[PDB]
Amino acid sequence: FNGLTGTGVLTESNKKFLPFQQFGRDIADTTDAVRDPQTLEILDITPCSF
Amino acid sequence: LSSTASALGKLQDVVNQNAQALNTLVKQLSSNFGAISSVLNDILSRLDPPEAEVQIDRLITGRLQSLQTYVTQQLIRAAEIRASANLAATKMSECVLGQSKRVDFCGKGYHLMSFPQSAPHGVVFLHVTYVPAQEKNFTTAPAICHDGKAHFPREGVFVSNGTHWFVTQRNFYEPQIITTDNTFVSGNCDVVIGIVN
Amino acid sequence: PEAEVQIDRLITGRLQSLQTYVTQQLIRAAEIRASANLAATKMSECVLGQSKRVDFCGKGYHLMSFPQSAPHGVVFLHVTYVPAQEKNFTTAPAICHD
Amino acid sequence: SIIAYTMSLGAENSVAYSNNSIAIPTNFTISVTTEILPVSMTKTSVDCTMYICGDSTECSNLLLQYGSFCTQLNRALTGIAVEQDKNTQEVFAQVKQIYKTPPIKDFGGFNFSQILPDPSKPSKRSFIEDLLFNKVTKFNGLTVLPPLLTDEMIAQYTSALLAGTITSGWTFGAGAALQIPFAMQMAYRFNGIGVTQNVLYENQKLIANQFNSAIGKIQDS
Amino acid sequence: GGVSVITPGTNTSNQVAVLYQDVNCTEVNVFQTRAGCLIGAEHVNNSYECDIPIGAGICASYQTSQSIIAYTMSLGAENSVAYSNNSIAIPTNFTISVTTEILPVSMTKTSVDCTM
Amino acid sequence: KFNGLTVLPPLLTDEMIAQYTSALLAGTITSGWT
Ligand SMILES: *[C@@H]1O[C@H](CO)[C@@H](O[C@@H]2O[C@H](CO)[C@@H](O)[C@H](O)[C@H]2NC(C)=O)[C@H](O)[C@H]1NC(C)=O
Ligand SMILES: *[C@@H]1O[C@H](CO)[C@@H](O[C@@H]2O[C@H](CO)[C@@H](O)[C@H](O)[C@H]2NC(C)=O)[C@H](O)[C@H]1NC(C)=O
Ligand SMILES: *[C@@H]1O[C@H](CO)[C@@H](O[C@@H]2O[C@H](CO)[C@@H](O)[C@H](O)[C@H]2NC(C)=O)[C@H](O)[C@H]1NC(C)=O
Ligand SMILES: *[C@@H]1O[C@H](CO)[C@@H](O[C@@H]2O[C@H](CO)[C@@H](O)[C@H](O)[C@H]2NC(C)=O)[C@H](O)[C@H]1NC(C)=O
């Protein structure tokens, strides 16, 4: 998404995203959630269980 | 316990210190460490692998230094926790398991017994203690001469209300008429200092 | 740009100096804390009350403990019981009268 | 000259163990033993930013890249300083109420003047305490923090514990201080170690002289 | 001078006192302490139990309208034992009380994969 | 969290800790110091 490659399980996210917001980022700078470029649907980012 | 969380505050503080160390590692990932971007992926996407590695090397040195500092803090905290655990084990062995003659080892006053209470990452000891409630002043004699022979109490010390002489234990006031069985006879009155008749 | 690279080499050494200083202080503090805990235990079981522990407060039988203020330290003076003159006597575990 | 030798293991004494013989002391002596423990280390606070950067904006920008690395070290140093104050407070403050010895020294002749703080000195500290203090002897962001408890306070805390031991015996540690004659308190100490109380009263003059001599020897040492 | 902020709980009060370490008040409610110049605290002759430790025998509490104040911390009530050569005190009555001591046996276990 | 930082559960469960404390407590109440 937006030139960033990450591996994680993809699920819809309950948290609302404002129109300006395209991504949700943790303090650690890891991207918790992203909004799809093709369609504006909020998706939670969950890393595959380890 | 219900009114104040301060008593469990020290246990909470230890949990907070562990959480702070994890939070510090999260903050470190945000730090650039001299790299163009803090995120490893951002450097990899915009730079060739050989070029990206040099920026990674700078992030790795900072991250390794952060991990070493975090491990050192955890080891020092573990050593402090181990010392507290050793003290707790000593308290359980010499208070909960058996009465302690050590002074103030388990609470102010004379410890009788202790009760263990489960706590998160902690142990709580409740110790029953003996504390004087009411105290009175009585005239006292080191020794008493029945026939010019010094008498020293086998148990307790001489006390006098102001009319009669009694022998009672130091811990609690239980006046008893002085008897030859109660007080052993040793030495003579002249040798003893402050002796009364 | 060039000055910052030289400053960065100094920063890495200076940050290392603070990290080494903090680690040494923490180890010294842990040793000091253990000594303080031992001092607190001695004050509670010796100055506050007589101790039945053997040699807990000085050689011989401890009677009382005295504390004197010292810079970053505590001093305990313990009155002890030591035999001065000793003599040998014949002894029996038990004696029979009747 | 410097010499090389096997270190001695101490003088060797052979106990005369006997099935029918025991050794019981006919005479005893009273001695004072001195044990010194450092309660706290000097509190020092160092500013990592001042040490790392000599008032340089470029250095500060590089320090921002380090980020939390500078903050954790300063936080640890502040914690060490708080710990030293906590250790000092716990050891010195073991007495709920400050205690003062009576002006008349009716203690059976056992002098306690040299262990007691001196009023004439502007700071009230014992002569023995003064000897202990005498024997013990920047712009980079390195700073020294004064202890929460002042040296005079520390002396007042030791004096309160000392007064409770001298006048109330062990009662002050258990709870409210209870007055007891010092000679009777000494007899209680003998009873605790199992020596008969009468023996102490018979040798009370000898014990008082031995105690005074032992305190004097400690000051000389 | 390092700036140390003496602050009571935010819910309790928003008032703050500023202490500057090892500097006179002129370099920067006026008090001078060994730790440094004290501002936002008014010196009180009366001694109170320490609430916040400013340092150098000086402590800060919120007291009457209530304001942060600077005072020498109390050493506890002063009691003189009535020591007597011929008199002893023996308790006529006693009380049974339970004391609580809490120690942390272990710290939360954390495992970090350095490689990840 | 997802950085490889993990929390490990203790070998002794809180209920097990309560059972241990109870055993010591019961021994003090019924058998005294024996
Ligand atoms: C208390 O009793 C003792 C013992 O009877 C008295 O001591 C005696 O005093 C007389 C007169 O000085 C001597 O002759 C005896 O030899 C002493 N006996 C001994 C060895 O104790 C003492 O004087 C009495 N005190 C009072 C105040 O009556
Ligand atoms: C000295 O002790 C005697 C002990 O007999 C006290 O007399 C007793 O006082 C109690 C309380 O008033 C009475 O119940 C007893 O019947 C009294 N006994 C006798 C024999 O009279 C005497 O009061 C005491 N003196 C003081 C100052 O307490
Ligand atoms: C404390 O020490 C002083 C000085 O040694 C003692 O006072 C002496 O007492 C003896 C015996 O009565 C006299 O012979 C000396 O002349 C006294 N010296 C002085 C300077 O007064 C004192 O008795 C001891 N006990 C106390 C009161 O603490
Ligand atoms: C028991 O031991 C004590 C202590 O050694 C003896 O007291 C000593 O007596 C000598 C001779 O008068 C003095 O020089 C010492 O200074 C004394 N020491 C102290 C500190 O008291 C005492 O004389 C001995 N008694 C017996 C039975 O011999």
From Swiss-Prot, chain A:
<comment type="subunit">
    <text>Binds to host ACE2. RBD also interacts with the N-linked glycan on 'Asn-90' of ACE2. Cleavage of S generates a polybasic C-terminal sequence on S1 that binds to host Neuropilin-1 (NRP1) and Neuropilin-2 (NRP2) receptors. Interacts with host integrin alpha-5/beta-1 (ITGA5:ITGB1) and with ACE2 in complex with integrin alpha-5/beta-1 (ITGA5:ITGB1). May interact via cytoplasmic c-terminus with M protein. May interact (via N-terminus) with host bilirubin and biliverdin, thereby preventing antibody binding to the SARS-CoV-2 spike NTD via an allosteric mechanism.</text>
</comment>
<protein>
    <recommendedName>
        <fullName>Spike protein S1</fullName>
    </recommendedName>
</protein>
<comment type="function">
    <text>Attaches the virion to the cell membrane by interacting with host receptor, initiating the infection. The major receptor is host ACE2. When S2/S2' has been cleaved, binding to the receptor triggers direct fusion at the cell membrane. When S2/S2' has not been cleaved, binding to the receptor results in internalization of the virus by endocytosis using host TFRC and GRM2 and leading to fusion of the virion membrane with the host endosomal membrane. Alternatively, may use NRP1/NRP2 and integrin as entry receptors.</text>
</comment>
Curated annotation (Swiss-Prot), chain E:
<feature type="glycosylation site" description="N-linked (GlcNAc...) (hybrid) asparagine; by host">
    <location>
        <position position="11"/>
    </location>
</feature>
<feature type="glycosylation site" description="N-linked (GlcNAc...) (hybrid) asparagine; by host">
    <location>
        <position position="93"/>
    </location>
</feature>
<feature type="glycosylation site" description="N-linked (GlcNAc...) (high mannose) asparagine; by host">
    <location>
        <position position="85"/>
    </location>
</feature>
<comment type="similarity">
    <text>Belongs to the betacoronaviruses spike protein family.</text>
</comment>
<feature type="glycosylation site" description="O-linked (GlcNAc...) threonine; by host GALNT1">
    <location>
        <position position="64"/>
    </location>
</feature>
<protein>
    <recommendedName>
        <fullName>Spike glycoprotein</fullName>
    </recommendedName>
</protein>
<feature type="disulfide bond">
    <location>
        <begin position="50"/>
        <end position="59"/>
    </location>
</feature>
<feature type="disulfide bond">
    <location>
        <begin position="25"/>
        <end position="37"/>
    </location>
</feature>
<feature type="glycosylation site" description="N-linked (GlcNAc...) (complex) asparagine; by host">
    <location>
        <position position="45"/>
    </location>
</feature>
<feature type="glycosylation site" description="N-linked (GlcNAc...) (complex) asparagine; by host">
    <location>
        <position position="24"/>
    </location>
</feature>
